[PDB]
Design a protein around this ligand. Structure first.
Ligand SMILES: Nc1ncnc2c1ncn2[C@@H]1O[C@H](COP(=O)(O)OP(=O)(O)OP(O)(O)=S)[C@@H](O)[C@H]1O
Lengths: 124, 69, 422, 185, 148, 211
């Protein structure tokens, strides 16, 4: 107990939104080989990942909720629900590390933990 | 009454301190005073860049060449 | 158990606010975030809620009239202590120096000292401290919102009196930075056009039906004595008219409209007659000459002189012409849009002596008018305001747009379309 | 002698016209300070005020040097006007509170006037924020304010930089009074 | 021939077809020269030969000009034609000092206008609903400002 | 329903106090037992609550804008798209807006006959039929936008870490002050692609969101 960490056993418990965010970030890291992504770019990638799967009723449910908690009455969100919230829940937790620019589409983002352990966490 | 009660003279009015625009404006509003005689000199060839018509009006500069090398 | 008031367009917000706020300090959460952009009446719906429920107790602060967190703390202290002195005149008290606090912890200690003496209270009572516009503090930092969130915890839990905050903020780009706290919050969306008109008319009829100018012109014209409704009709009609004619220009504001109305009401009154009062149509067709221009402006043939005209018109030439080309296109033998690049002295003098119509070599009036310009902030320096007039690293750049350049060129009769080529 | 004669003539003319236009403009709104622009102003024109007993008439002058930010403008102005209230009067927070406490602390109601000495060089975002700040002072009714803009020139230059929503606050009652030694000769 | 005073018209119009082009600073047009004016003449003449009508009338010049210048919702051209006709009508009523104009008066104005529309009464009921859609659309748009 | 709302919260937020903040009003708002039972059976109030919580983050703002604001916005986004860095001046936005309006007028049949009934003076020649706003007025809409945060300065540190660095940055005599209003290179906050996904196609400018 004085050696083992928890970041793995933690990230295996985050909200599905958070895991989606991290997995998208890893796809970006390996796609651009830069280990540095732009926040809005990550949003675009999340849109990708949601739409690459077909119009499957289950993808339909995901799209619906993740973009509006049901209730078609209010819908058509630009960026996913809780996205600000989950971003912060990551950032303050020391996992994610972000610079400070009030422009929230070209601000940088970097993983503090190793990419490897994160990937492994995604694998469980 | 109109008589000189102090004579101030500035060496190198383009000095690294006097040329500071704050110092320049202070000396302008100063030189507005009649009972003082203002006489100075510079070295910077760009001396006229220092004063607008406001500061010139304050100074009423009259120029004289002195070249002794 | 509380009387929820009614507001024309705050139904949900009124209900949820009365739900997040009551007499019982126990079921009342610590903080609260009335969020929304300027023009949604937060400062008004909140007031019209409190005036409906007078049994409770609140304090009203104006974070914009204050500047920093230091005066903020001091004002909080003084207002709280005075509010309590005026809320229970019987209890003896020792007022603590509200100008003594200068640190967020000093505030907590002071409040503890203030509350420990009120322990002779008959029941747990709340005290709602309203910060009206915690966003607009001119010295905001990341580390202030939480600094004020956490005061609930530091203070004792079983005090006879319970301080509960109500923050007000806008620019959701700010509230987002503090989502994870999950503090309860209400949002006020901006209004649509129709409801804007509704609020505006029901708020300004009392101003316009009884203003001085209209009532004057009543007797100043044929009397045509009539009931109050006729003035209601004409005022509301003018309101719908101005809003439906300037909406696209003003957005969904309520203040901008409350400015246009007063700027365009007197003249509109002047353009009424004996007949049009029963005819809004011809009234409009007559007063038209104002409904179609803001006239919110209260190209000048600048006083500057010939040498100044040429100085400026040459100092504009390297907003596109880098020194790579000038010695070509000007020898003695699009970036029109983008922000201008930086000159350097003695290049300005170069192009000047070039395009001045051997005629002139004196440079006393030249530099004289140069300093004139720099005082007019038409060719400002990127560097400081005092050492520019030396020759250290220093760059000069024009701060006049291109239309005044056209003007100066045509007036001086020199042409400029040449030197720009693409 | 004839020079100084005409000089004092024009000087008294300017003082007279500005003192005249400063008052008598009873604008029934009475919730927005009246503004006095000085077209082509040299920015050196001194100003006088009515003595006007039972109400202090405190002049306030701000230089583009005095204006690093909003807070220090506010504090310098507050200190200046408090010192003036003292000189007229014979512990106080350098803030807006001094306004409303003013009556209680000095008896007579207040009427200040602001003289931005040389506006063209002041960073207009700061001045704008400061004016929006001042706007809050209109909830006390024992004070009234007035602004004296000493624009070097080009009223269009000013109305190019400020927030239009604040222009629409100044435009309540303005007066494009000119101050130029050179006008029709 | 150009005997119709469209001639004068055409001149003025060509002016703006130069003005709208603002190459650099009063620098010559890429796309339009006087040859384009001669072209406008020919395009007009050709539209006339199309309609089998001599003596080009200004509307012809108008069509030639707009054709030369290029480079819910229902069929877009129909909507914009409705817009143009209705706006001309309202402008004429403005000039003539006629009292007012109502939505149903405009719908009957079109009743007047498009009778060669033909088809069936069903069509008239449909085209009427379309007209009301369009007028309320303009209302929702900012083209004509409503009253009362 | 309540089960579904709980599951939604779990998948997205995975945080109890959030759901608690959602519940507090729904319960406390009711007046009679039957009404509260109805609510918790349908949980409709959670819908309005989600909505209002969501009301004006970035989409509600976009929806609460009139025509001309939307036009300035779209055109400015297109200008940002052209340039690589996205940095677009105000003048560029205005020029692009002007040529867009020129286009919108252009695709109108533009009939301007001159003749009429003898001595009619009728048959007016209205052709532009879109009130292209001037430079002098648009600045209002530009300020409205830039304070509705659809835009931002080129590179602006929003809020410093603490009051120390914030104060040390307020003492900074900035120079963007010196550059005029219509040159501050504002970068974008909502990119054109997204912009195409939200503006309801009913709007008469929808055909310009897409390039
Ligand atoms: N529902 C309403 N009924 C009546 N008047 C309203 C209503 N909503 C807004 N108003 C008016 O609009 C004004 C705007 O109030 P504010 O709360 O100051 O606006 P704002 O959104 O708070 O911007 P501020 O003042 O900078 S916080 C109110 O003072 C009322 O006069």
């Amino acid at each position: 107990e004085t050696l083992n960490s928890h970041v793995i056993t933690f990230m295996t418990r985050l909200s599905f939104t958070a895991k989606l965010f991290i997995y998208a970030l890893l796809n970006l890291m390996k796609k651009n080989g830069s280990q540095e992504q732009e926040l809005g770019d990550i949003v675009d990638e999340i849109k990708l990942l949601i739409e690459v799967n077909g119009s499957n009723k289950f993808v339909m449910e995901i799209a619906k909720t993740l973009f509006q908690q049901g209730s078609d009455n209010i819908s058509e969100q630009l960026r996913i629900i809780s996205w600000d919230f989950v971003l912060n829940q990551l950032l303050d937790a020391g996992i994610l590390f972000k610079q400070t620019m009030k422009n929230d589409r070209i601000c940088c983002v970097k993983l503090n933990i190793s990419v490897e352990e994160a990937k492994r966490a995604m694998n469980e | 009454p109109l008589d000189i009660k102090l004579i101030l003279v500035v060496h190198n009015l383009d000095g690294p301190s006097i040329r500071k625009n704050t110092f320049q404006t202070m000396l302008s509003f100063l030189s507005v005073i009649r009972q003082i005689a203002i006489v100075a000199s510079t070295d910077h060839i760009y001396a006229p860049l220092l004063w607008d018509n406001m500061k010139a009006q304050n100074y009423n500069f009259v120029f004289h060449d002195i070249s002794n090398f | 158990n509380v009387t929820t008031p009614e507001v024309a367009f705050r139904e949900y917000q009124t209900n949820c606010l009365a739900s997040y706020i009551s007499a019982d300090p126990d079921i009342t959460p610590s903080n609260l975030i009335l969020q929304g952009y300027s023009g949604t009446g937060k400062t008004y719906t909140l007031k019209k809620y409190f005036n409906a429920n007078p049994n409770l107790h609140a304090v009203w602060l104006e974070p914009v009239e204050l500047v920093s967190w230091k005066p903020l703390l001091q004002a909080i202290a003084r207002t709280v202590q005075y509010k309590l002195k005026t809320l229970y005149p019987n209890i003896p008290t020792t007022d603590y120096d509200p100008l003594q606090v200068e640190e967020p912890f000093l505030l907590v200690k002071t409040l503890h000292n203030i509350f420990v003496q009120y322990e002779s209270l008959q029941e747990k009572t709340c005290l709602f401290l309203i910060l009206d516009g915690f966003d607009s503090l001119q010295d905001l930092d990341a580390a202030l919102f939480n600094k004020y969130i956490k005061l609930n915890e530091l203070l004792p839990k079983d005090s006879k009196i319970n301080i509960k905050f109500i923050y007000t903020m806008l620019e959701t780009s700010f509230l987002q930075r503090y989502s994870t706290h999950c503090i309860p919050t209400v949002m006020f969306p901006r209004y649509n056009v129709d409801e804007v008109s509704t609020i505006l008319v029901m708020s300004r009829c009392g101003e316009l039906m009884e203003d001085s100018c209209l009532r004057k012109r009543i007797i100043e014209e044929q009397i045509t004595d009539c009931t109050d409704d006729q003035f209601q009709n004409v005022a509301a009609n003018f309101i719908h008219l101005i809003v439906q004619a300037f909406h696209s220009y003003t957005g969904n504001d309520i203040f901008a409209l409350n400015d246009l109305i007063d700027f365009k009401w007197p003249k509109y009154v002047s353009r009424i007659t004996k007949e049009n009062i029963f005819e809004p149509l011809a009234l409009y067709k007559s007063a038209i000459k104002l409904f179609l221009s803001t006239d919110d402006n209260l190209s000048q043939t600048y006083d500057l002189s010939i040498i100044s005209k040429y100085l400026l018109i040459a100092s504009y030439i390297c907003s596109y012409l880098e020194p790579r080309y000038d010695a070509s296109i000007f020898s003695r033998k699009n970036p029109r849009y983008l922000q201008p690049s930086l000159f350097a002295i003695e290049r300005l003098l170069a192009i000047f002596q070039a395009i001045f119509p051997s005629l002139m070599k004196a440079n006393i009036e030249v530099f004289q008018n140069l300093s004139e310009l720099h005082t007019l902030k038409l060719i400002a320096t990127t560097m400081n305001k005092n050492i520019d007039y030396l020759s250290p690293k220093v760059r000069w750049k024009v701060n006049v747009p291109w239309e005044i350049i056209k003007e100066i060129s045509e007036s001086v009769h020199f042409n400029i379309s040449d030197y720009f080529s693409d | 002698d004839q020079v100084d004669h005409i000089i004092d003539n024009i000087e008294a003319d300017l003082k007279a016209e500005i003192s005249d236009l400063l008052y008598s403009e009873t604008t029934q709104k009475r919730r927005c300070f009246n503004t006095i622009f000085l077209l082509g102003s040299d920015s050196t024109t001194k100003i006088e005020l009515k003595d006007e007993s039972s109400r202090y008439n405190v002049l306030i002058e701000l230089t583009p040097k005095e204006s690093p930010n909003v807070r220090m403008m506010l504090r310098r102005s507050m200190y200046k006007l408090y010192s003036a209230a003292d000189a007229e009067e014979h512990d106080v927070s350098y803030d807006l509170s001094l306004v409303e406490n003013f009556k209680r602390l000095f008896g007579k109601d207040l009427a200040m006037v602001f003289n931005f000495k040389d506006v063209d060089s002041i960073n207009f975002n700061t001045l704008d924020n400061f004016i929006i700040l001042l706007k809050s002072a209109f909830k006390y009714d024992h004070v009234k304010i007035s602004l004296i803009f000493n624009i070097n020139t080009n009223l269009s230059n000013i109305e190019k930089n400020l927030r239009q929503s604040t222009i629409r606050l100044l435009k309540r009652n303005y007066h494009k009074l000119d101050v130029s030694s050179n006008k029709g000769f | 021939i150009l005997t119709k005073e469209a001639r004068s018209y055409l001149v003025e119009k060509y002016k703006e077809l130069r003005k709208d082009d603002a190459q650099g600073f009063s620098r010559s047009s890429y796309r339009i020269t006087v040859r384009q004016l001669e072209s406008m003449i020919r395009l007009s003449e050709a539209i006339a030969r199309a309609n089998c009508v001599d003596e080009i009338t200004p509307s012809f010049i108008a069509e030639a000009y707009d054709l030369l210048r290029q480079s819910t919702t229902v069929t877009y051209d129909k909507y914009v034609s409705m817009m143009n006709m209705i706006v001309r009508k309202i402008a004429e009523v403005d000039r003539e000092g006629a009292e007012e104009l109502t939505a149903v008066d405009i719908v009957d104005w079109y009743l007047l206008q498009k009778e060669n529309d033909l088809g069936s009464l069903a069509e008239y009921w449909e085209e009427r609903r379309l007209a009301f859609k369009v007028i309320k659309r303009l209302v929702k748009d900012r083209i004509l400002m409503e009253i009362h | 329903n309540l089960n579904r709302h709980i599951r939604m919260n779990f998948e997205t937020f995975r945080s109890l106090p959030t759901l608690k903040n959602s519940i507090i009003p729904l319960v406390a708002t009711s007046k009679n037992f039957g009404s509260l039972c109805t609510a918790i059976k349908s949980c409709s109030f959670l819908d309005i609550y989600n909505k209002n919580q969501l009301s004006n983050n970035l989409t509600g703002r976009l929806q609460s804008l009139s025509d001309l604001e939307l036009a300035i916005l779209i055109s400015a986004a297109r200008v940002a798209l052209r340039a690589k860095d996205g940095s677009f001046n105000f003048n560029l936005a205005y020029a692009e807006y002007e040529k867009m309006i020129k286009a919108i007028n252009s695709r109108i049949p533009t009939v301007a006959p001159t003749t009429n009934v003898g001595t009619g003076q009728s048959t007016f020649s209205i052709d532009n039929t879109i009130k292209l706003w001037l430079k002098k007025d648009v600045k209002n809409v530009w300020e409205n936008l830039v304070q509705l945060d659809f835009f931002t300065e080129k590179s602006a540190v929003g809020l410093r870490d603490n009051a120390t660095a914030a104060f040390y940055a307020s003492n900074y005599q900035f120079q963007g002050t010196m550059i005029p209003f219509d040159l501050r290179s504002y970068q974008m906050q909502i990119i054109l692609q997204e912009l195409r996904r939200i503006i309801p196609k009913s709007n008469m400018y929808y055909s310009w969101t897409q390039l």
